[PDB]
Design brief:
Two copies of one chain form a homodimer. By secondary structure, chain A is an alpha+beta fold. Chain A has one domain: Nuclear Transport Factor 2, Chain: A. The first copy, chain A, has a three-stranded antiparallel β-sheet, with helices on one face. Chains A and B meet through helix 1 of A and helix 1 of B. Chain B: This is Baseplate wedge protein gp25. Chain B: One of its GO terms (cellular component) is virus tail, baseplate. Chain B: Belongs to the GpW/Gp25 family. Chain B: Baseplate protein that is located next to the tail tube (inner baseplate). Involved in sheath assembly. The gp25-(gp6)2-gp7 module is involved in sheath contraction.
């Protein structure tokens, strides 16, 4: 019926088959959370008018060498406010003037594994 | 005047933990809304992200739609919000509007006793 498993004595032979699954699920949910934070217009969500980022169309139509830094601070504060699972955080915005776009490069670490640097890279328009 | 209660480990208090828990709950509810209102397959970096809530789903609404949507939402939440412990999704159809009442009761991993909830209306595009 069943071949019995000798688990009466089992110290260092302990296995955890959920480590990589729960860690990689955590990372996936964090990246999707980041995308939702960045792509939601701040003030558009009535249950939380503070949620999201301020990325108006004038910010893309009138691009200056300060746009990158202001968008960097905006995104950084939004992520600190709405994704507490991120430990180390660094946002770099590249203004692509010829097509009026912004490259958002987010390098971060997860609270559980603050050593590994994960990264996402998006391109925003209007 | 001496308030040395923090000296004993049993009498140790941190009055900022409830604040951090509140901020975490707000971020969880916002993540939930993101998951519920994103069409599954529409996100290129993760085609598994979101829910199956289509114009066909809202237009061809039957008394089985509720259970279908409850299961779909439960699966999306289990797959994309691991901070949620206990989870119950109750969907009530509004046929004359082609809309859905979605109630989500859940607990947070850090303290699984307290039951939180959101309640939202969903419609087609």
């Amino acid at each position: 019926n069943i071949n019995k498993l000798y688990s009466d004595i089992d110290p260092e032979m302990k296995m955890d088959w959920n480590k990589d699954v729960s860690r990689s699920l955590g990372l996936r949910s964090i990246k999707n959370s980041l995308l939702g934070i960045i792509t939601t217009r701040k003030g558009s969500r009535p249950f939380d008018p503070e949620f999201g980022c301020d990325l108006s169309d004038q910010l893309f139509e009138n691009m200056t060498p300060l746009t990158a830094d202001t968008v960097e601070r905006n995104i950084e504060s939004a992520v600190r406010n709405y994704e507490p699972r991120i430990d180390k955080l660094a946002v770099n915005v590249i203004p692509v003037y010829d097509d009026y776009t912004l490259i958002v490069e987010i390098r971060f670490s997860v609270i559980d594994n603050p050593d590994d640097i994960e990264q996402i890279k998006l391109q925003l328009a209007s």
